[PDB]
Amino acid sequence: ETRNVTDLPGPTNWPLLGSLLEIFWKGGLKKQHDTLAEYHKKYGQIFRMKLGSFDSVHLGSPSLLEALYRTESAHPQRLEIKPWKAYRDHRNEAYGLMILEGQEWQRVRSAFQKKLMKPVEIMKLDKKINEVLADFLERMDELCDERGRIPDLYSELNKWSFESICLVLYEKRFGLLQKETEEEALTFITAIKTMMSTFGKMMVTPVELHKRLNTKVWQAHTLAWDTIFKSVKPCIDNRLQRYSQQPGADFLCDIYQQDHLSKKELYAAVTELQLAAVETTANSLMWILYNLSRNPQAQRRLLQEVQSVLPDNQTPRAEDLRNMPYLKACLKESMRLTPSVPFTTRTLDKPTVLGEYALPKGTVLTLNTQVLGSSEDNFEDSHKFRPERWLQKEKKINPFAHLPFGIGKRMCIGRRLAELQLHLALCWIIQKYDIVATDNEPVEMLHLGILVPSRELPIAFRPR
Numbered sequence: 001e002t003r004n005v006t007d008l009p010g011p012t013n014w015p016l017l018g019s020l021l022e023i024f025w026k027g028g029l030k031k032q033h034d035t036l037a038e039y040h041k042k043y044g045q046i047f048r049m050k051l052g053s054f055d056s057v058h059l060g061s062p063s064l065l066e067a068l069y070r071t072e073s074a075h076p077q078r079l080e081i082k083p084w085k086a087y088r089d090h091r092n093e094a095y096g097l098m099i100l101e102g103q104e105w106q107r108v109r110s111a112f113q114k115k116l117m118k119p120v121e122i123m124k125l126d127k128k129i130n131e132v133l134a135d136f137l138e139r140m141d142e143l144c145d146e147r148g149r150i151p152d153l154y155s156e157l158n159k160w161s162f163e164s165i166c167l168v169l170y171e172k173r174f175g176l177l178q179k180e181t182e183e184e185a186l187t188f189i190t191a192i193k194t195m196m197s198t199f200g201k202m203m204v205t206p207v208e209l210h211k212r213l214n215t216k217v218w219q220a221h222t223l224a225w226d227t228i229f230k231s232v233k234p235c236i237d238n239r240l241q242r243y244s245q246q247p248g249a250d251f252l253c254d255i256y257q258q259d260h261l262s263k264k265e266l267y268a269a270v271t272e273l274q275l276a277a278v279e280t281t282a283n284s285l286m287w288i289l290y291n292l293s294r295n296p297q298a299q300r301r302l303l304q305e306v307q308s309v310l311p312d313n314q315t316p317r318a319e320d321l322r323n324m325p326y327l328k329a330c331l332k333e334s335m336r337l338t339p340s341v342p343f344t345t346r347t348l349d350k351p352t353v354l355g356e357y358a359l360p361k362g363t364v365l366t367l368n369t370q371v372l373g374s375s376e377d378n379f380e381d382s383h384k385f386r387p388e389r390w391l392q393k394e395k396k397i398n399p400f401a402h403l404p405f406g407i408g409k410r411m412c413i414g415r416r417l418a419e420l421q422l423h424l425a426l427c428w429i430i431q432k433y434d435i436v437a438t439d440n441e442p443v444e445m446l447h448l449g450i451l452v453p454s455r456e457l458p459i460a461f462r463p464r
Ligand code: HEM
Pocket: 078, 097, 098, 099, 109, 272, 273, 274, 276, 277, 278, 280, 281, 284, 340, 341, 344, 345, 404, 405, 406, 407, 408, 410, 411, 412, 413, 414, 415, 417, 418, 419
């Protein structure tokens, strides 16, 4: 009928360190995802692992993630991010979607979800997205060197992503793409960087103690968040004021006027939207550009579609995407082979059976969403970039085999907007450029928050 947590297989619990010893000898935390995939190959779909006192059970199969979904809490919960909450408490700001829990989370989630995860409303953003892409492409052919290579492509892809989502979120152009207008968002963006490189140092050492002792990390983290909030508020206020007498004209006013979220609540929620959006979206664009340079046949099949559905250099539109099944399949394939987010996390709020294992309340689960990419039950030749696998109707790919955006009600809220931006960015890029590999040397995926390349990506942009 049922076995329990103790009967779970898994790696040796080495004295004091647990699997931390193995990780420090297998590449470090940067390579953690390679190690977890190795473990799922050894012990199968479900296993138990300790990293110091950090004890977790890993789920690495489509059936397990289906089971977890069918039985999930009405308010699913990830691992707590203490430093962000400590800052909000200290400064009396609201929590956003990433740190909210319970009915408080559901309230904000519903309100935003009806705007963000509605195709009809999302497609309305395309004009804005195209305005930013137009500018980005213009900047691209300025940055391209002699042989079509863009120095620090990741950084530039981030500039686009930032500018794109800020137009969507704040109806403003921050001017990341035109030089001379570069030093406007400068302090805002540096504050984001400072914040990102600092909150991680307060997750082992308790944030309460950093606060009590008034450490330099606590100080830097507080200043960085202050600056982020001080930059966001006026934008949201101006947008709120602009449409205060036009119900139905703006997703943000409607939320404010009809769902009754306070301005304080909107500051936190919009802020977390932006933080979640920027790097991950740029990261995904990057990986697809890399997969394209490595698969000229797939890139050719893609070029044909773009040129077929958009003769001349016709500005892409959201409605055109309906007739580009291959474009959309390239993105899915890229996210399966080279995902941005390697895993997510859940704390169980009630006893539940997964596999033939009964897991108690309080069990921390890591959903290895990456490892799903290599299961031969769903992907024959899983090490091959083949977008075709998504288009053939003579074999079902099980939806719980492909989860780059997580699962269930607490899954990524930005899915449609991210897809829309990526789809259109691909149209603009391929339309103008051939994506060529500049070398054939090894490139590795490092876990640095998200999965990033081990080095500058060997790709060039050759004006077609
Ligand atoms: C291509 C880039 C994207 C990737 C792969 C992606 C991936 C994810 C994943 C894996 C999670 C966790 C889901 C879970 O635990 O089940 C997540 C949540 C989140 N994402 Fe995205 N992300 C994308 C872009 C976006 C964008 C465009 C936004 C903002 C519009 C966004 C905002 C959110 C927020 C706020 C959460 C938390 C939702 C909640 O707790 O209720 N992401 N992202």
